[PDB]
Subunit: 173 residues, 3 copies
């Protein structure tokens, strides 16, 4: 259960002049990396989607949709704006048992095609982190996948902690 440490926040860029309206809608998880994310060849990770809706109060309603055990699973969360535009905290955190901390930081995006987002959580006093490569479609270029691999490794993650979920049709369209 030992973990690769979370990198210091100084190694995680923040998207300059983040546009919260432009970031909204559905994003597909085309890449996923983290200290508790592990490549499994026997049962490879299926792609899921995360949907961001801006509320009147500028927090996001965030719905994660996955296909799991023959069903569509839905996680509905609230992202509250954080210290800087492009950062978020999880709303009503006390209703998640074990969870003492949950940070979101958008690293880069061009809004209409791709994004990279960094997440850090403390759960049972264990510090987990992950990075998602988002696409507005289910596919992205080599170039972007490679940049995402390089960025994940710059945060201390080896190859086996970096996965490219297999596109599917169920639940996420």
């Amino acid at each position: 259960s030992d973990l690769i440490p979370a990198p210091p926040l100084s190694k995680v860029p923040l998207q300059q002049n983040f546009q919260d309206n432009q970031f909204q809608g559905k994003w597909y998880v085309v890449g996923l990396a983290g200290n508790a994310i592990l490549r499994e060849d026997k049962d490879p990770q299926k792609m899921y989607a995360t949907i961001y809706e801006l509320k009147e109060d500028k927090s996001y309603n965030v719905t994660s949709v996955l296909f799991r055990k023959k069903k569509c699973d839905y996680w509905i969360r609230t992202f509250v704006p954080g210290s800087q535009p492009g950062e978020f905290t999880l709303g009503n955190i006390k209703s998640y048992p074990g969870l003492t901390s949950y940070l979101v930081r958008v690293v880069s995006t061009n809004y209409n095609q791709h994004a990279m987002v960094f997440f850090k959580k403390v759960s049972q006093n264990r510090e987990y982190f992950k990075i998602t490569l988002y696409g507005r479609t289910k596919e992205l270029t080599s170039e972007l996948k490679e940049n995402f691999i390089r960025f994940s490794k710059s945060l201390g993650l080896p190859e086996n902690h970096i996965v490219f979920p297999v596109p599917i049709d169920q639940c996420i369209d």
Copy 2:
């Protein structure tokens, strides 16, 4: 005495099709700046500034320019009133600007979430000035976009020494 490159006819200045006023709001950095009274100065190069567009209830923009000057943040506040067609504006309360008889704004192109080019024309002391700004949501833009902006500026009659790329800074505009 003043000698000015003439303003181009408006037919040489495109208009962004189906302009989305809500999407054009927020902060834009001035990454490129060209005009008949804009001059490159190597001794004291132009610092980057930002312009912030807020849509009002009545669809005019509140427009705030933020510059770093003499060690402080300077703030210019104006109003852009919608014009003949979407993407064009006039300056509100023009009589409070002494000498100013005319001021036109036309958004040439934008993709809203990264870049824009805006054309401005004003008549001040009966002198016809114009400029073009290359806007970015970030402080940097691609070669491709800078070159496009250079080409467009030249298509309106401006030589190289009337086209500048303000140097990125952190003070005031972050």
Copy 3:
């Protein structure tokens, strides 16, 4: 304007001398003694590279001038590294103590950039040519302008010769 240090002039990696041969049109031309003559802008010329048995190039420049086709013939001898050349029989050029050629980049079948440096009367001249297999190029003109400026040259030292039909076809 001073010649830039050679460290600011790339060399084409793994230069293919056979593939570089044939006719190249001079679509761009820049240098510290090249000046836009705006009143009567310069005509395009061509430069033809023929590989000899001994791997030197026979290099023929063809211009249209005074109603005639003019021909300048020189020899480029391979230098320290593939893609670099020296001028052959340099001692027959009076005043010329040095002449270097360095191919900066090329894709062989469309475009190239070549850097030239010479010392003549103890004055250090340099120029850069943008070569095309055709008389027109794209993006590539802008790249050539930015490269020329990276070596210290302003806009007025960068020219785009006008395409013509006489002599160079």
